[PDB]
Structure formats: C-alpha cells, structure tokens
Symmetry: C2
Subunit: 101 residues, 2 copies
Amino acid sequence: MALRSVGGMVIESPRNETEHWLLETVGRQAQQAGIGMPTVAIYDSADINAFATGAKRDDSLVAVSTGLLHNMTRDEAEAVLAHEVSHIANGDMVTMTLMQG
Amino acid sequence: NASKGMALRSVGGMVIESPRNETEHWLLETVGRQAQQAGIGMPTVAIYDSADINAFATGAKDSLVAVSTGLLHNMTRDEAEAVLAHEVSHIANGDMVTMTLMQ
Ligand SMILES: [Cl-]
Ligand code: NA
Ligand code: NA
C-alpha cells in the first residue's frame, strides 16, 4: 500500500545510470545496516522527498521523488538515503523533505 | 507556589533559553555539540506540541531546530540524537529540512 497510494513505480532492474546508482546505493546501505534489499521506487513530485519503511505492515521500501533525483547531487542524496535506511532497519517509516537555500 | 523551582513541562512553541526540565537540557547540549562539530553557530531550539513525530530545521539565514513532543515521547535519546545530527547537517549546508516518522 505504501507504494500504490503514491503511484510509485518500482525499479525491477537498472536500465539507466540513475537507476543503477539508486539500486547500488540502497543495496550497499541495506547490506551495511544488516537488512534485506528493500524494493526501490521512484514517484512523481516536484518536492525533494524520500520516504522509506521497514514497518512490519509494509514490504520493505525506499521511494524517492523525481524532484529529489533532479535537484540533489549523488553525494547529497546518498546521505539522505543512508539516514532513511537506518530507520528501515529500526522497523519504522520515515519521510523527509528538503528545500535548498 | 509549590511548583516554583521544580522541573516543569516544556511550553510548546517557546524558544528554549534556560532549560525547564532534563530533556530540555539534553536537547540544548546535543544540538550544541552537533552544531560545534558541523562548524556552525548554535541554532535556536524549540519544542512544539504535536502527537506526530517530527523535527524540522532551517539554516536559510541564525538557524532554528524545532522538535515535536510526539518525537520526544516516542524516540530514545540515541534515536533522537541521530535525527538531530542529520538535520544539523542540512542546516550546515544552508538548507531546510523536515522529517516525520510513523513508528
Ligand atoms: Cl518531554
Ligand atoms: Na515527475
Ligand atoms: Na499532528
């Protein structure tokens, strides 16, 4: 439900540099946090947002907005994702929204 | 008259100057340490009343960090410290951030 309700679109295998980077980044962070690979999705929003859940209720998931991928550098986005993966590992849902100054 | 000098409940929406209770002291100390480590000035810190678990911050100008009572009720010190450290990193970049948890 966490994905469907936002119209999130799952990346099943990487087909461009952005998908490759997102999967490898989340994969490395999940590995380091001692958890299974989450489903990874992109959804449409102008906001710079990522949300993630490792709650019992949900399939494990990391979803990033198109606005995040458009506006964040890889280094910036990797920091946000690493923090959200820490919440998944805690069995929580997290959403974070940023605005650049 | 009985309550004068005792630890008091945080006032939602009030900027924290002199801690009213031990959580306020911990919050100033934690944010102060993170700010020092990130190389920025001490943010203004406030607690606001909400059942939602949220902290937000802005470093666009100096900065402010605002934490919900829901967050303080629901997160351990280590968990809250990690959220605050992450938000301080955004302030240090001159950015603004808001983060909400559903536990
Ligand atoms: Cl409290
Ligand atoms: Na879009
Ligand atoms: Na609320």
